[PDB]
Amino acid sequence: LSQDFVEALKAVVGSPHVSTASAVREQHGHDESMHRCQPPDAVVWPQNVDQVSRVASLCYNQGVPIIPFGTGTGVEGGVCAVQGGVCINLTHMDQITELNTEDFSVVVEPGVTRKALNTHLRDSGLWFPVDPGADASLCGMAATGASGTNAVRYGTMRDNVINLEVVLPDGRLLHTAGRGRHYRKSAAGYNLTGLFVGSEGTLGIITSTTLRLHPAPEATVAATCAFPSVQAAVDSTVQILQAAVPVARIEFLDDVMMDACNRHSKLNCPVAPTLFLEFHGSQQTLAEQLQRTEAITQDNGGSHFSWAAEKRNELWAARHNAWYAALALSPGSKAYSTDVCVPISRLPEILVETKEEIKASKLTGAIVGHVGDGNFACILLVDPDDAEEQRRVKAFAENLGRRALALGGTCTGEHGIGLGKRQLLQEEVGPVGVETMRQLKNTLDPRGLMNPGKVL
Numbered sequence: 001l002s003q004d005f006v007e008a009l010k011a012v013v014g015s016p017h018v019s020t021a022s023a024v025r026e027q028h029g030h031d032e033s034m035h036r037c038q039p040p041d042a043v044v045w046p047q048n049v050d051q052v053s054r055v056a057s058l059c060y061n062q063g064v065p066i067i068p069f070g071t072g073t074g075v076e077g078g079v080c081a082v083q084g085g086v087c088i089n090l091t092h093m094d095q096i097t098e099l100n101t102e103d104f105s106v107v108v109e110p111g112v113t114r115k116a117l118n119t120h121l122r123d124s125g126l127w128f129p130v131d132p133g134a135d136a137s138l139c140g141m142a143a144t145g146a147s148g149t150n151a152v153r154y155g156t157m158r159d160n161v162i163n164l165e166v167v168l169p170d171g172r173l174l175h176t177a178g179r180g181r182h183y184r185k186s187a188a189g190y191n192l193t194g195l196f197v198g199s200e201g202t203l204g205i206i207t208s209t210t211l212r213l214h215p216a217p218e219a220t221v222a223a224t225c226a227f228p229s230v231q232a233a234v235d236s237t238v239q240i241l242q243a244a245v246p247v248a249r250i251e252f253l254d255d256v257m258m259d260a261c262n263r264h265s266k267l268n269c270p271v272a273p274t275l276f277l278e279f280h281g282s283q284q285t286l287a288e289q290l291q292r293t294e295a296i297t298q299d300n301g302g303s304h305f306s307w308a309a310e311k312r313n314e315l316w317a318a319r320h321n322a323w324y325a326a327l328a329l330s331p332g333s334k335a336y337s338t339d340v341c342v343p344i345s346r347l348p349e350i351l352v353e354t355k356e357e358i359k360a361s362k363l364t365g366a367i368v369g370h371v372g373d374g375n376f377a378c379i380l381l382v383d384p385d386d387a388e389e390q391r392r393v394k395a396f397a398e399n400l401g402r403r404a405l406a407l408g409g410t411c412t413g414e415h416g417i418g419l420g421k422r423q424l425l426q427e428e429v430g431p432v433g434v435e436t437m438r439q440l441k442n443t444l445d446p447r448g449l450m451n452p453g454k455v456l
């Protein structure tokens with residue numbers, strides 16, 4: 001970047017909020033995945049929405065790419081500055097506003113994480129359920145279309161984002177559902193909110209998200225259940241869903257993942273393919289759900305439930321840290337993850353096949369998943385200097401993605417496309433789907449400067 005351009009950035013946000021230092025740029029050139037660090041030319045921290053708009057306008061009109069940056073916990077290289085440009089770290093805008101506990105809604109700026117929001121909501125009787133394992137920006141979660149362990153019951157970001165405030169690439173300010181609006185449903189015009197959820201910073205910069213809040217459960221019971229095989233655990237999952245048990249959380253760990261989590265969190269669960277389960281309701285409904293769910297797990301050889309506030313917190317903290325538990329198996333490694341989501345009846349085939357394919361390869365892989373959604377991840381751990389292994393991991397990852405597509409599924413349930421799944425997306429939606437998404441990208445970002453090289 002030219003000195004005049006850097007000075008123009010400083011005129012918007014203040015000198016302390018622009019950095020061209022190599023170390024600062026490198027820290028903002030990668031996320032939590034193995035995608036190689038590609039440092040932006042500068043990092044900028046806008047202090048309010050007017051500054052976001054003015055930074056975007058400056059970059060856009062000068063032909064400088066823009067990379068929105070939340071907490072950098074993505075796993076598909078979304079923040080990697082493949083074409084250089086200006087990384088906009090949005091986290092200094094960290095206010096919670098418009099808390100409407102009678103309407104079950106709240107507005108959050110990009111610096112607000114789920115942990116911050118739920119802390120703010122203590123003693124309100126309400127909580128925000130969508131729970132990625134990382135302490136991520138809620139606006140970043142809206143940008144990636146995130147889900148979590150609670151999504152099976154409480155919905156994904158797509159289900160729980162009611163409105164978005166978006167700085168469009170040329171600086172215009174859009175409130176997708178209208179400024180200040182919040183409501184349960186609408187047929188008014190075209191739904192713009194859903195277009196920006198899962199847009200990954202390629203259509204605009206989310207500067208606030210209006211979120212649906214949920215009532216805290218009357219009572220909570222968590223447990224683990226060990227199974228003799230992956231087949232038995234996944235058949236149990238499908239049967240629980242087909243029986244319509246309204247489970248709050250149903251998470252799968254294969255034996256490799258279970259052992260990794262044991263070693264990383266001081267859990268002592270039997271090393272086996274395992275379901276972590278949670279149930280919400282009254283004492284009467286809990287007993288009913290438990291009895292129907294234990295009957296199904298027993299049919300498939302599940303252990304008697306190992307019951308788990310502080311043990312439950314310990315259980316879910318270990319699950320939330322599964323990514324790092326995997327990484328700890330091979331110190332110094334980075335990881336790539338698959339994220340397929342298939343029709344639930346096909347989940348047994350593809351999980352068992354994935355386990356068999358991992359075993360037949362020399363690759364280390366841990367399997368963990370939001371199986372209540374028909375979704376799972378294979379975390380594939382790689383030596384950053386071993387080029388040949390990564391090609392095998394990439395090849396394994398595409399082949400699994402294509403297998404999910406053959407089953408009528410999707411290549412990503414929650415993580416997004418970023419740099420890693422662009423070819424899979426083309427196969428998933430075909431030429432008319434690709435052209436339609438690209439036309440939408442072009443009307444919002446004519447110059448192609450809004451996080452270039454990602455998604456499409």
Ligand SMILES: Cc1cc2nc3c(=O)[nH]c(=O)nc-3n(C[C@H](O)[C@H](O)[C@H](O)COP(=O)(O)OP(=O)(O)OC[C@H]3O[C@@H](n4cnc5c(N)ncnc54)[C@H](O)[C@@H]3O)c2cc1C
Pocket residue numbers: 031032067068069070071072073074075077078079090110131132133134136137138139140141142143144145146147148149200201202204205206207320321322323324414415451454
């Ligand atoms: C341990 C661990 C566990 C995880 N568990 C889950 C899980 O259960 N479910 C899940 O879905 N993901 C999970 N993730 C992935 C990641 O946390 C989510 O994708 C999260 O939504 C990323 O948010 P972020 O702000 O950290 O993203 P970043 O890495 O900062 O950015 C991600 C992408 O979104 C864009 N972006 C970020 N903020 C904005 C914004 N305000 N406006 C526009 N674009 C923006 C970026 O340009 C980039 O393309 C996990 C990650 C880790 C490390």
